[PDB]
Design an enzyme around this catalytic site. Structure first.
Site, short mmCIF file in Angstrom:
data_model
loop_
_atom_site.label_atom_id
_atom_site.label_comp_id
_atom_site.label_asym_id
_atom_site.label_seq_id
_atom_site.Cartn_x
_atom_site.Cartn_y
_atom_site.Cartn_z
N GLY A 103 6.33 -15.73 -4.18
CA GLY A 103 5.55 -14.67 -3.57
C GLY A 103 4.37 -14.21 -4.39
N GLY B 272 1.25 -8.12 -4.34
CA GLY B 272 1.07 -7.12 -5.37
C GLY B 272 1.90 -7.35 -6.61
N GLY C 28 4.20 -9.95 -7.28
CA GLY C 28 4.27 -11.32 -7.74
C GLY C 28 3.14 -11.63 -8.69
N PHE D 210 -16.20 10.57 -14.23
CA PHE D 210 -16.14 9.25 -13.64
C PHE D 210 -14.75 8.76 -13.26
N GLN E 71 12.26 2.97 5.91
CA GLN E 71 11.31 4.05 6.08
C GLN E 71 10.46 3.85 7.32
N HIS F 266 7.27 4.97 8.91
CA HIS F 266 6.05 5.71 8.62
C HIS F 266 5.78 6.70 9.74
N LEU G 249 -0.87 0.55 11.08
CA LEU G 249 -0.85 1.79 10.32
C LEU G 249 -2.16 2.54 10.07
N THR H 291 -3.28 5.33 7.27
CA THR H 291 -3.06 6.06 6.02
C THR H 291 -2.67 7.55 6.03
N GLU H 292 -1.55 7.84 5.38
CA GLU H 292 -1.05 9.20 5.24
C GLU H 292 -2.14 9.99 4.52
N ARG I 133 8.44 11.91 3.79
CA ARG I 133 8.39 10.89 4.84
C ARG I 133 9.42 11.03 5.96
N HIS J 115 8.00 0.89 8.61
CA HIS J 115 7.01 0.69 7.57
C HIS J 115 7.61 -0.01 6.36
N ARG K 285 11.33 6.44 0.20
CA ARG K 285 10.22 6.13 -0.71
C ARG K 285 9.09 7.15 -0.60
C1 LIG Z 1 2.53 -3.10 5.86
C2 LIG Z 1 1.82 -2.02 5.02
C3 LIG Z 1 2.42 -1.70 3.83
C4 LIG Z 1 1.86 -0.73 2.94
C5 LIG Z 1 0.62 -0.04 3.30
C6 LIG Z 1 0.05 -0.39 4.54
C7 LIG Z 1 0.62 -1.38 5.43
C8 LIG Z 1 -0.09 -1.70 6.75
N1 LIG Z 1 0.01 0.94 2.45
C9 LIG Z 1 0.68 1.24 1.18
C10 LIG Z 1 0.10 2.19 0.34
O1 LIG Z 1 -0.99 2.83 0.56
N2 LIG Z 1 0.80 2.44 -0.85
C11 LIG Z 1 1.98 1.83 -1.24
O2 LIG Z 1 2.50 2.16 -2.31
N3 LIG Z 1 2.55 0.88 -0.40
C12 LIG Z 1 1.89 0.60 0.79
N4 LIG Z 1 2.45 -0.35 1.63
C13 LIG Z 1 3.62 -1.08 1.31
C14 LIG Z 1 3.25 -2.21 0.37
O3 LIG Z 1 2.16 -2.94 0.98
C15 LIG Z 1 4.31 -3.20 0.04
O4 LIG Z 1 5.45 -2.62 -0.55
C16 LIG Z 1 3.87 -4.29 -0.94
O5 LIG Z 1 2.69 -4.94 -0.37
C17 LIG Z 1 4.89 -5.28 -1.17
O6 LIG Z 1 4.28 -6.21 -2.06
P1 LIG Z 1 4.89 -7.58 -2.49
O7 LIG Z 1 3.94 -8.14 -3.48
O8 LIG Z 1 6.31 -7.42 -2.86
O9 LIG Z 1 4.86 -8.40 -1.15
P2 LIG Z 1 3.63 -8.80 -0.31
O10 LIG Z 1 4.19 -7.93 0.73
O11 LIG Z 1 3.40 -9.85 0.71
O12 LIG Z 1 3.90 -10.34 -0.81
C18 LIG Z 1 5.11 -11.13 -0.66
C19 LIG Z 1 4.70 -12.54 -1.16
O13 LIG Z 1 5.78 -13.51 -1.07
C20 LIG Z 1 5.40 -14.67 -0.33
N5 LIG Z 1 6.52 -15.12 0.41
C21 LIG Z 1 7.41 -14.45 1.31
N6 LIG Z 1 8.33 -15.23 1.81
C22 LIG Z 1 8.06 -16.49 1.23
C23 LIG Z 1 8.63 -17.78 1.32
N7 LIG Z 1 9.69 -18.05 2.08
N8 LIG Z 1 8.05 -18.82 0.55
C24 LIG Z 1 6.97 -18.60 -0.25
N9 LIG Z 1 6.36 -17.36 -0.38
C25 LIG Z 1 7.02 -16.39 0.43
C26 LIG Z 1 4.20 -14.21 0.50
O14 LIG Z 1 3.43 -15.31 0.91
C27 LIG Z 1 3.55 -13.22 -0.35
O15 LIG Z 1 2.67 -13.82 -1.28
O1 LIG Z 2 2.71 4.32 0.71
C1 LIG Z 2 2.83 4.90 1.79
O2 LIG Z 2 3.92 4.80 2.43
C2 LIG Z 2 1.64 5.71 2.30
C3 LIG Z 2 0.77 4.75 3.13
O3 LIG Z 2 1.09 3.56 3.44
C4 LIG Z 2 -0.44 5.25 3.57
O4 LIG Z 2 -0.77 6.45 3.27
O5 LIG Z 2 -1.22 4.51 4.27
#
Ligand SMILES: *Cc1cc2c(cc1C)nc1c(=O)[nH]c(=O)nc-1n2C[C@H](O)[C@H](O)[C@H](O)COP(=O)(O)OP(=O)(O)OC[C@H]1O[C@@H](n2cnc3c(N)ncnc32)[C@H](O)[C@@H]1O
Ligand SMILES: O=C([O-])CC(=O)C(=O)O
Ligand SMILES: CCCCCCCCCCCCCCC(O)O[C@H](COC(O)CCCCC)COP(=O)(O)OC[C@H](O)COP(=O)(O)OC[C@@H](COC(O)CCCCCCCCCCCC)O[C@H](O)CCCCCCCCCCCCCC
Ligand SMILES: CCCCCCCCCCCCCCC(O)O[C@H](COC(O)CCCCC)COP(=O)(O)OC[C@H](O)COP(=O)(O)OC[C@@H](COC(O)CCCCCCCCCCCC)O[C@H](O)CCCCCCCCCCCCCC
Ligand code: HEB
Ligand code: HEB
Ligand SMILES: COc1[nH]c(=O)c(C(=O)[C@@H](C)C[C@H](C)[C@@H](Cl)CCl)c(O)c1OC
Ligand SMILES: COc1[nH]c(=O)c(C(=O)[C@@H](C)C[C@H](C)[C@@H](Cl)CCl)c(O)c1OC
Ligand code: SF4
Ligand code: SF4
Ligand code: F3S
Ligand code: F3S
Ligand code: FES
Lengths: 113, 238, 588, 129, 113, 113, 129, 119
Positions: free
Chosen positions: C14, C17, C19, C119, C240, C242, C252, C254-255, C286, C354, C399
Site C-alpha cells: 500500500g 499516506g 505506506g 508564516f 465512523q 461522517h 465528502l 470537509t468538517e 463525530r 467515512h 476517531r
Molecule cells: C475517503 C476520505 C478519507 C479522508 C478524508 C476525505 C475522504 C473523501 N479527509 C481526511 C482528513 O481531512 N483528515 C484525516 O485525518 N483523514 C481523512 N480521511 C481519511 C484518510 O484519507 C485515510 O485514513 C487515509 O487516507 C488512509 O491512508 P492509507 O495510506 O492507510 O491508505 P490509502 O487509503 O489508500 O492507501 C492504501 C494503499 O494500499 C494499496 N492497496 C490496498 N489494497 C491493496 C492490494 N490488495 N494490493 C496492493 N496494494 C493494495 C492502495 O493501492 C494504496 O496505495
Molecule cells: O478527518 C476527518 O474525519 C475530518 C474530514 O475528513 C474532513 O474534515 O473533511
C-alpha cells in the site's frame, strides 16, 4: 551560453576580441599611412586608392572585423549598465542591426567604385 | 432513454489490431449520470471491458479519457454533455501513449518527464528555520494553480508537441511542475533548475496551441506557467 | 519450484499516506524495500483527504499536546489507548514540521479580513478540539500530503511496484509471516515477494456499504488477508459515519466548513446541534453530530429534495473569498455532485460511512498482535500494519477528525524508525515451501477455474445492501442477528461465483472479484463485532442498550478467526499511560 | 516485433478522431505558412531578378504576372506571408506581455487575427490584379 | 548543443527568431508602403527604387535575416515530422544551401542594378 | 567548447565538414565539366561563363564553403602538430584571415565581371 | 629535468622504425593534400582574378600557364585536389554505410582510391597541357 | 563499468536475450594489451585528450549493453572535439590487435549514436 553574447563562452569572447583588434590595427595603420602621404586629395588619387583590389578587401575585412569586435564590446557594456532586461535586448538589437548595416553598406559603397 | 456508445477495444492476446465495439445502455431517464457510471454498467454487461478509476470525485486522475475527440475526466463528464440523438458517444484512450488494454494507456513517458524536472523541493539547508519555513501568504499564493495538478495526463495527451517528442519535450504537466518549484520560496536551486531547462526541447517546443488549458479537469493553466519559465530563461541567459 | 521470488528485507503493501511515509523511512535506514500499490501511488484514497492535519503546533494560538490527549480520549470514548495517543500527540508537532521541509503546500498566516500572523502553517478549527490546531493546505491537505510523499519517494529512489495486486500473505512453517503473493495487473503475471517484514498499509474499506465517502478502491483487502491467514481484528464494529457527506453522491465535504463557521440546520431553521450539543455546538464530536441529523430524519422532520432526506449545511454567510481561499475544494464538490453553489445556498449532507476505526491490532512500533492460549498479547512474526487498516488503538470508538493523517505519518514513520530493531527481536524466520505459498494462490486459482458460477455483481450489491441497513448508524441485536445470517448465505453463495474475463493484459475484473472476497470477509467480522458488543458508545449505537457499559464493555472487541474455519469473539483493554487519564461523562 | 522478439502496442492518433480548438488551428496554419513563405522567397527572388536585369527583363516580368494562373499564386503567397506575419506578432505579444495567456483571451486573439489576415489578403489580391 | 540547430540552445533560438522577425517586419512594411504608392510601375520608377542605397541595404539585411529566421524554423519542423535521421540531415542540407543562395543571389541581383 | 574550433562540439565539426564537402564536390564537378568541354578558351567563352548568374552564385557558395571546411580541417591539424599555444593561435589567425579574404576577394572578382 | 628537479623518460617514436599499413599511408596523404589545397585556392583565386580583369589580363594569364614550370605546379595542385576529393568520398562512405569497416575492406578501398586518383591525375595533366 | 539505475529490479539476474548478449562479442574480450592505442598516430599526439581505440571499444561495450541504463549520459560525455572524433580511420588498430578485435568498427558506431543524439 548567454544568448545575447557573440562568443560561446568567456575564452571565445576574449579571443575573438583580441584577434579582430590585431586585424583592425593593421587596417588603421595602412589607412593612416595612405592619408599621411597625400595632403591634397584629388578625386583621381582618392577614387584610385579605393579602386585597388587590396583596398576593397581590407576595408571590408575591417567592417566584418568591427561587427565581431564591437558586438562583443557593446554587449559587455550593456551587460554592466543596462540592468532592465527588456531595454537591453532592444539595445543589442539596434546595435547589431547597426553593425550588420555597416558591413552591407560597406559592400555597396565598394563595388560601386 | 436509450444511450448509444462507441468504445475503443484492444486485447493484445485476442485482437491483432484495435477496433470500436458498439454498446447500448437503457439507463433510467430520471436524471443524468457520469460517464464513469455508464462505463461501470456496461462493465456488468461486459466484463472484458476495462478502464481505470477510483476517487470517483475528480481528484485522483485515474479516468483520463478522450470522449468525443476531447480529453476529460469520466468521473465528472456529465452524460448530458455527450448525448446527441442519431449519433453515438465515442470513447477512446488518451492520444499519444501506448495502449495497454481497451481504455488504459501506459502512462510511461508522462511520469518520465515528470521526474526529469525534479518533482521535489531542493533546499540547501543554509540558514535553517527554528520550526517551519518562513512563508508569507503572498509567496505561498504563488503556488496556487500549480500544486493542484492531479497527474491525470489530460493536457500532455492533448499536445501535438508531445505526440512528436514525448521523450524530449517535457510537456504541459511537467512544465507546470517545473514552475511549481521555480517559484517556491523554499526552493533554493532555482538557477540550477533553469540551466537544466535551457535546451531546444525541454521548454521551447511549446508553440502556445493551448489544448492543455482547453482540457484541464482542474482548471489549471500550463501555458501561462510555461511562458513564465520562458521568461526566467531570458532573464538568466540573455 | 515454478513461481518467481523477489526477496526484500521489507515489503510495504500500500502506497498511501502511511505506506509511503514508512516506505520512505525504512529506505532511510539502508534497508532494501519494495512498495506495492493497486493503483498509481497518487491515486491512493489519501488524496481525497480535505480537513487538515490536527496537531498542536501552537501556531494559531498558544497550546500543548496534553490538551490534544484529553480532546482525543473523550473522542475515542475512553476506549483509545493512552500510551499510543500520548506518543502520537507528543511526537506529532515534529512529525508534521518534517513534511513541511519536504515541501508540503501548507497555507500560511498573515494579512486577512480580521486576522494576522507570521508564516507558520495555518491551523483551522475542527470538531473535537477546543480551538484551532488543524494544519491544512486549503481544502486539499491530503492531496498535498500524498503528492509530497510521492515526490519524496521519487527523490530517495524507492522501489515501487505500481499497480500490483497483493493476493494473500504467506505463512511460515513456524506460523510466521514471510512476505506475500501478488499479481502484476499490467502483465497479469503472479509473483511471491519474500521479506523479513511485511507491512500492510492497505487502508480502509467503507465500500461494504451502498453509500460511502470512500473510493471504489477501499475494499478491505488488508483485512481479508489478515483473517484468511489467522490474525485477529480489533474493534471491527467501530465505523465512523461522517456527519457531512453529499446526498446521493457519498462524496465528502470537509468538517472544516463548520471549522470556518458552517451551519448544520433543519427545515424549521433551528440549529439542532446547538440543542443536541449545547456548548460544543456544531464543533461536537463525530458520533454525536452524526445521530443528531439522522434523528431529525426518523422523526420525519428533515429537509428533502431531488437529493433526499437531509440537513442543510449553510456556508453562504461566510465570505465568497473565505470560501475560495479556505475551501476552494468544497465549492467544486458541491456544485458538481450536489448542483448547489455553496456561496449562495446550503449543501445537502447526510452522515455517511467515512473512516474505519478497527483493523489489525498493533503496538506503537507497528508490529501486528494476536492472542495467546490465556488470551495474552503475542506479536506476529513478520507482520506489521500502519494506517487505517491498522488498529493501533489510537482512535478507539470514535476517531477525532484530522487525527487520521497524523496517525498515518507518526505511526507509519514509527513503523520505519523501529523496523531494524523489530526484525532483530523476532530473530530469523524460516523459508516457505511450495505448499506454504501454494496456499496463498488458492483464492486465485478459484476464480480462474470457476467459470460457470454465479455473477459477482449481485453478491456485491447484496453484501452492500445488507450492511447498509442492519449496521448503519443505529443498530440492534435482532438486526445484526438477521444480517449476520444473510451474510453466511452470501459468503457461501460467493464460493460459487465466477470470473468471466480470463485474459492477462489488465484484467479489471479479476481484481474486482478478488477485492470481493475481501469486501465480504470484512463486513462479516464487522457484524460479528457489532452484534457482540452489548453497549452504546461512539459509533456503535444500539436501541436496546442506550448507554455505555463502563464495567463490562470498557475494552476492545477482538474478532478471532482461523482462516476459513469457524469464527469467535474476545476482548482487550488499555488506560495506563504517563500523566494519567480517567473515564468520565461524554457531554459535547 | 523485431527479429525473434514480438509485439508492439497500438496508439490512438487518428487526427480525424481528435477535436481541435481554434487556437490549435491558428498555430498549425502559422507553421504551414512558414514553410510556404520559405519556397516563396525563391520565387520572388527569381522574379525580382528578371525585373531589374534590363528592359527586356522588366517586360518579361510584367508579362508573367499577367497570366491569371500566376496572379492566383502571387496572391496565395502574399496571403500566406500575411497570415504568418500577423500570427507571428500575436506570438510575440504573448511572449512579451501584451496578451493574457488565458484560453478565452487565446481564442479572441486567434479570431481577431484571421480577421486582419483576410483584410490583408484582400488588399494583396487588389495589388496582384 | 544540437549540431543541426542554428542557435546554441533554446534561449538562443528563441531570441534569434524574434529579433529577425522584427527586422523582417519593418522590411515588409517598407516594401508594402512603396508598392501601395505606385500602381503603374514604370521600369524607371522600379529600377530607381532599387538603385537607392537604402533599398539595397534593407533588401540584403532581409535576406540575411531570412537565412537566420528560416533556418531555425525549418529546423524546428523537420525536427518534428522527419524522424529518420539520414533523410532529415539531407533536408536541412538542401534547405540551408537554399537559404545561403537566396542571400548570395541577392547580392548578385543588387549590385547589378 | 574550444575557442579556436569552429564547431560547438565534435558532432558540429563532423557534420559541418561533411556537408561542405558535398557542396564543394558538386561545384568541382560542375567546374570540371565546363573546362572539359572547352579546350581552346576564348576570352569570350571565359568571361561569358562567369557572367552567368549561376556561375557567380556557385563560385561564391564554394568560397564560403571552403572557409567553413578548411577552417575546421586546418584547426584539426594545428591541434595535432603545433603544441606551443602562442604559435598556434597566431597560425589559426593567419589561416582564418586568409580564408575570409578568399571569399571577399571572391565577391570583388565576381561583381567585377 | 626542470630547475632543481631532474630526469625525463625516453619515448619510442622513431617513425622510420614503425611500420605503416596502406590504410595509414592513405590518410596521412589526405591530410597533406588538405593543407596543399588550402594554399592552392589562393593561387587559383589570383589566377582567376587576372583572368577576368580584362583582355590584357586574360592574355597575361594564358601566358603564365604557358611556362612549363607553372604547368607542373598547376598539375600537382589539381592532383592534390583530386586525391583529397576521392579519399574524402571514401571517408564519407565509411562514415555513412557504403563500406565495411574491416581491415581488408580498408586496404581494398585505399587501393581502389590511389588507382582512381592516378587516372584523374592523368586527365588533370592532359588539361594543364 | 555497468551503470544501471536499478529501476525495475530483476527477480534473480538481468533479462538478457542471446540476441542482445551477442552484441557484446568483440568488445568484452579486449585484454588491455595496449597494442592498438600504441599504434595510433592520433594517440601519440593527444594521449590525454583523444580516448584511443582500446577505450573506445570499452565505451561502446557499455553503450550497447542491455543492462546499462545511462546510454544517453555516456553519449553526451563523448560529444567533444577530441574524445571520439580524433579517429581518422587509419586502421593500424585493427591491423595489430592480438585478439582480432575491431576498434574502428566500434568507433564508427559510437559516432553514429552521436549523430543520432546531437543532430
Ligand atoms: C475517503 C476520505 C478519507 C479522508 C478524508 C476525505 C475522504 C473523501 N479527509 C481526511 C482528513 O481531512 N483528515 C484525516 O485525518 N483523514 C481523512 N480521511 C481519511 C484518510 O484519507 C485515510 O485514513 C487515509 O487516507 C488512509 O491512508 P492509507 O495510506 O492507510 O491508505 P490509502 O487509503 O489508500 O492507501 C492504501 C494503499 O494500499 C494499496 N492497496 C490496498 N489494497 C491493496 C492490494 N490488495 N494490493 C496492493 N496494494 C493494495 C492502495 O493501492 C494504496 O496505495
Ligand atoms: O478527518 C476527518 O474525519 C475530518 C474530514 O475528513 C474532513 O474534515 O473533511
Ligand atoms: C501590419 C502588418 C503589415 C502587413 C504585412 C503583410 C504583407 C503581405 C500582405 C500584402 C498586402 C498587399 C496590399 C497591397 C495594397 O494595399 O494594394 C493597393 C490597393 O489599395 C486599394 O484597393 C485601396 C483600398 C483602400 C481601402 C481603405 C494598391 O494596389 P494598386 O491599386 O496599385 O493595384 C495594382 C494596379 O492594378 C497596377 O498594378 P501593376 O500593373 O503595377 O502590377 C505590375 C505587376 C508586375 O510587375 C513586374 O513584373 C515586377 C514584379 C516585381 C516583383 C518583386 C517581388 C519582390 C520580392 C522581394 C523579396 C525580398 C526577399 O506587379 C505585380 O502585380 C507586383 C507584385 C508585388 C508583390 C509585392 C510583395 C512583396 C513582398 C516583399 C517582402 C517579401 C518578404 C519575403 C520574406
Ligand atoms: C568524381 C570526382 C570528381 C573529380 C574531382 C577531382 C577534380 C580534380 C581533377 C582534375 C581533373 C581534370 C581533368 C581534365 C580533363 O578531363 O581534360 C580533358 C582531356 O580529356 C582527354 O585527354 C580525353 C581522354 C578521354 C578518355 C576517355 C580536356 O582537356 P583539353 O583537351 O581541353 O586540353 C586542354 C587543351 O590543350 C587547351 O588548353 P587551353 O589552351 O585552353 O588552356 C589554357 C590555360 C590558360 O587559360 C588561362 O589563362 C585561364 C586560367 C583560368 C584558371 C581558373 C582557375 C579557377 C579557380 C577557381 C577557384 C574557385 C574556388 O588554361 C589552363 O590550362 C586551365 C587550367 C584549369 C585548372 C582548372 C581547375 C579548377 C579547380 C576548380 C575547383 C577548385 C576548387 C578549389 C577548392
Ligand atoms: C512578424 C514577424 C515574422 C516574420 C516577418 C516572419 C517571416 C518568416 N518566417 Fe517566421 N516566425 C515568427 C515571426 C515571423 N516570421 C514567429 C514568432 C515564429 C515562432 C513559431 C513558434 O514559436 O512556434 C515563426 C516561425 C517560423 C517558422 C517555424 C514554424 C513553426 O511554427 O514551427 C518558419 C518555418 C518560419 C518561416 C518564415 C519565413 C520564410 C518568413 C519570411 C522571410 N517562421
Ligand atoms: C569530397 C569532399 C571534400 C572536398 C571537395 C574537400 C575539399 C577540401 N578540403 Fe577536405 N575533407 C573531406 C572531404 C572533402 N574535402 C573529409 C571527409 C575530411 C575528413 C578528414 C578526417 O576526418 O580526418 C576532410 C578534411 C580536410 C582537412 C583536415 C585534414 C585532416 O585529415 O585532419 C583539411 C585541411 C581539408 C582541406 C580541404 C580544402 C582546402 C578543400 C578544397 C576546397 N580537408
Ligand atoms: C505550430 O505547432 C503545431 N501546431 C499544431 O496545431 C499541430 C497539429 O495539431 C497537427 C495535427 C498538424 C500536423 C501538420 C499534422 Cl496534419 C501532420 Cl501529421 C502541430 O503538429 C504543430 O507542430 C508542433
Ligand atoms: C589523417 O590522420 C593522420 N594519419 C597519419 O597516418 C599520421 C601519421 O602516420 C604520421 C606518421 C605522419 C605525420 C604527418 C608525421 Cl610525418 C609528422 Cl611528425 C598522422 O599524424 C595523422 O594525423 C592525425
Ligand atoms: S495540469 Fe490539469 S490536465 Fe494537465 S495533468 Fe495536471 S490536472 Fe491533469
Ligand atoms: S590490441 Fe586488441 S586486445 Fe589489445 S587493447 Fe587493442 S582492442 Fe584490446
Ligand atoms: S498544448 Fe502544448 S504547445 Fe504548450 S501551448 Fe499547451 S503545452
Ligand atoms: S588507429 Fe587510430 S585513427 Fe581510429 S582508425 Fe584506428 S583508433
Ligand atoms: S476516479 Fe478519481 S478523478 Fe476520476
Amino acid at each position: 551560453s548567454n544568448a545575447s553574447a557573440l562568443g560561446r563562452n568567456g575564452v571565445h569572447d576574449f579571443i575573438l576580441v583580441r584577434a579582430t583588434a590585431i586585424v583592425l590595427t593593421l587596417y588603421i595603420i595602412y589607412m593612416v599611412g595612405f592619408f599621411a602621404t597625400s595632403g591634397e586629395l584629388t578625386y583621381e588619387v582618392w577614387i584610385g586608392f579605393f579602386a585597388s583590389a587590396f583596398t576593397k578587401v581590407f576595408t571590408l575585412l575591417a567592417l566584418f572585423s568591427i561587427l565581431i569586435h564591437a558586438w562583443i564590446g557593446m554587449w559587455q557594456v550593456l551587460t554592466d549598465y543596462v540592468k532592465p532586461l527588456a531595454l537591453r535586448l532592444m539595445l543589442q538589437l539596434v546595435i547589431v542591426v547597426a553593425l550588420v548595416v555597416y558591413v552591407i553598406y560597406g559592400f555597396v559603397v565598394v563595388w560601386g567604385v | 432513454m436509450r444511450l448509444e456508445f462507441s468504445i475503443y477495444r484492444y486485447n493484445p492476446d485476442v485482437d491483432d489490431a484495435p477496433r470500436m465495439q458498439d454498446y447500448t445502455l437503457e439507463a433510467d431517464e430520471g436524471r443524468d449520470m457520469m460517464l464513469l457510471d455508464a462505463l461501470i454498467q456496461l462493465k456488468e454487461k461486459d466484463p472484458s471491458l476495462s478502464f481505470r478509476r477510483s476517487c470517483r470525485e475528480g481528484v485522483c486522475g485515474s479516468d483520463g479519457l478522450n470522449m468525443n475527440g476531447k480529453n476529460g475526466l469520466a468521473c465528472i463528464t456529465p452524460i448530458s454533455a455527450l448525448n446527441q440523438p442519431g449519433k453515438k458517444i465515442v470513447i477512446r484512450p488518451l492520444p499519444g501513449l501506448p495502449v495497454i488494454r481497451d481504455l488504459v494507456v501506459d502512462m510511461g513517458q508522462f511520469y518520465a518527464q515528470y521526474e526529469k524536472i525534479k518533482p521535489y523541493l531542493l533546499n540547501n539547508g543554509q540558514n535553517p528555520p527554528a520550526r517551519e519555513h518562513l512563508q508569507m501568504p503572498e509567496q505561498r499564493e504563488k503556488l496556487d494553480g500549480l500544486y493542484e495538478c492531479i497527474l491525470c495526463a489530460c493536457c500532455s495527451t492533448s499536445c501535438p508537441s508531445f505526440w512528436w517528442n514525448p521523450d524530449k519535450f517535457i510537456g504541459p504537466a511537467g512544465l507546470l511542475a517545473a514552475y511549481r518549484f521555480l517559484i517556491d520560496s523554499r526552493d533554493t536551486e532555482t538557477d540550477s533548475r533553469l540551466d537544466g531547462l535551457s535546451d531546444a526541447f525541454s521548454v521551447f517546443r511549446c508553440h502556445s496551441i493551448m489544448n492543455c488549458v482547453s482540457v484541464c479537469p482542474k482548471g489549471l493553466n500550463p501555458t501561462r506557467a510555461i511562458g513564465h519559465i520562458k521568461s526566467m530563461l531570458l532573464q538568466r541567459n540573455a | 519450484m515454478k513461481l518467481p521470488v523477489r526477496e526484500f528485507d521489507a515489503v510495504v503493501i500500500g502506497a498511501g499516506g502511511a505506506g509511503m511515509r514508512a516506505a520512505l523511512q525504512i529506505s532511510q535506514s539502508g534497508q532494501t524495500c519494495a512498495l506495492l500499490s493497486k493503483v498509481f501511488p497518487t491515486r491512493s484514497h489519501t488524496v481525497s483527504a480535505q480537513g487538515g492535519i490536527t496537531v498542536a503546533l501552537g501556531n494559531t494560538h498558544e497550546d500543548n499536546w496534553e490538551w490534544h490527549m484529553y480532546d482525543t480520549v473523550k473522542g475515542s470514548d475512553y476506549i483509545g489507548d493512552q500510551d499510543a495517543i500520548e506518543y502520537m500527540c507528543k511526537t506529532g508537532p515534529e512529525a508534521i514540521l518534517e513534511l513541511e521541509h519536504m515541501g508540503l503546500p501548507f497555507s500560511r498566516l498573515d494579512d486577512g479580513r480580521i486576522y494576522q500572523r507570521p508564516f507558520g502553517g495555518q491551523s483551522k478549527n475542527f470538531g473535537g478540539e477546543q480551538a484551532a490546531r488543524t494544519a491544512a493546505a486549503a481544502d486539499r491537505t491530503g492531496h498535498a500530503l500524498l503528492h509530497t510523499l510521492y515526490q519524496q519517494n521519487l527523490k530517495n529512489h524507492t522501489t515501487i511496484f505500481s499497480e500490483w495486486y497483493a493476493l494473500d500473505l504467506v505463512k511460515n512453517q513456524d506460523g510466521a509471516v514471510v512476505g506475500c503473493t501478488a499479481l502484476c495487473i499490467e502483465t497479469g503475471e503472479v509473483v511471491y515477494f519474500k521479506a523479513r517484514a511485511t507491512v500492510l498499509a492497505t487502508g480502509g474499506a467503507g465500500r461494504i456499504y451502498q453509500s460511502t465517502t470512500n473510493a471504489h478502491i477501499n475494499t478491505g483487502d488488508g483485512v481479508g488477508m489478515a483473517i484468511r491467514a489467522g490474525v485477529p481484528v480489533q474493534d471491527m464494529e467501530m465505523w465512523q459515519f461522517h456527519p457531512t457527506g453529499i446526498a446521493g453522491a457519498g462524496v465528502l465535504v470537509t468538517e472544516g466548513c463548520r471549522g470556518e463557521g458552517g451551519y448544520l440546520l433543519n427545515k424549521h431553521g433551528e440549529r439542532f446541534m446547538e440543542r443536541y450539543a449545547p456548548n460544543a455546538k456544531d464543533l461536537a464530536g463525530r458520533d454525536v453530530v452524526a445521530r443528531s441529523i439522522m434523528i431529525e430524519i426518523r422523526e420525519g422532520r428533515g429537509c428533502d429534495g431531488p437529493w433526499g432526506p437531509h440537513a442543510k449545511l449553510k456556508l453562504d454567510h461566510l465570505g465568497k473569498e473565505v470560501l475560495e481561499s479556505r475551501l476552494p475544494g468544497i465549492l467544486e464538490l458541491s456544485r458538481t455532485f450536489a448542483h448547489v453553489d455553496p456561496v449562495k445556498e446550503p449543501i445537502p449532507v447526510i452522515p455517511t460511512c467515512h473512516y474505519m476505526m478497527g483493523g489489525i491490532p498493533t503496538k506503537v512500533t507497528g508490529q501486528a498482535l494476536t492472542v495467546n492460549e490465556k488470551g495474552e498479547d503475542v506479536v506476529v512474526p513478520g507482520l506489521f500494519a500502519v494506517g487505517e487498516i491498522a488498529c493501533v488503538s489510537v482512535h478507539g470508538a470514535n476517531r477525532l477528525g484530522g487525527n487520521s493523517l497524523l496517525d498515518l505519518v507518526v505511526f507509519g514513520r514509527a513503523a520505519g524508525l523501529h523496523l531494524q530493531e523489530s526484525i532483530a527481536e523476532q530473530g530469523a524466520l524460516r523459508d516457505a515451501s511450495e505448499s506454504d505459498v501454494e496456499a496463498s494462490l488458492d483464492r486465485l486459482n478459484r476464480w480462474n477455474n470457476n467459470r460457470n458460477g454465479e455473477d459477482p455483481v449481485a453478491i456485491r450489491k447484496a453484501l452492500q445492501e445488507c450492511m447498509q441497513h442492519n449496521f448503519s448508524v443505529f443498530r440492534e441485536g435482532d438486526a445484526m442477528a438477521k444480517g449476520l445470517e444473510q451474510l453466511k448465505v452470501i459468503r457461501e453463495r460467493l464460493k460459487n461465483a465466477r470470473l468471466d474475463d480470463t485474459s492477462s493484459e489488465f484484467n479489471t475484473q479479476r481484481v474486482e472479484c478478488l477485492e470481493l472476497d475481501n469486501l465480504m470477509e470484512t463486513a462479516y467480522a464487522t457484524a460479528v463485532s457489532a452484534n457482540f458488543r452489548t453497549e452504546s458508545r461512539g459509533a456503535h449505537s444500539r436501541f436496546d442498550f442506550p448507554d455505555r457499559d463502563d464495567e463490562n464493555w470498557l475494552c476492545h472487541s477482538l474478532y478471532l478467526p482461523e482462516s476459513e474455519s469457524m469464527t469467535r469473539r474476545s476482548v482487550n483493554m488499555e488506560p495506563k499511560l504517563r500523566p494519567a487519564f480517567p473515564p468520565k461523562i461524554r457531554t459535547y | 516485433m523485431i527479429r525473434n522478439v514480438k509485439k508492439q502496442r497500438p496508439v490512438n492518433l487518428d487526427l480525424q478522431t481528435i477535436r481541435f480548438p481554434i487556437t490549435a488551428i491558428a498555430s498549425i496554419l502559422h507553421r504551414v505558412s512558414g514553410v510556404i513563405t520559405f519556397v516563396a522567397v525563391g520565387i520572388l527572388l527569381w522574379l525580382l531578378g528578371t525585373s531589374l536585369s534590363s528592359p527586356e527583363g522588366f517586360e518579361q516580368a510584367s508579362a508573367i504576372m499577367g497570366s491569371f494562373f500566376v496572379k492566383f499564386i502571387m496572391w496565395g503567397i502574399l496571403t500566406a506571408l500575411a497570415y504568418h506575419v500577423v500570427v507571428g506578432i500575436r506570438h510575440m505579444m504573448m511572449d512579451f506581455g501584451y496578451l493574457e495567456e488565458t484560453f478565452e483571451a487565446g481564442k479572441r486573439s486567434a479570431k481577431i487575427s484571421f480577421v486582419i489576415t483576410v483584410v490583408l489578403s484582400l488588399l494583396a489580391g487588389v495589388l496582384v490584379w
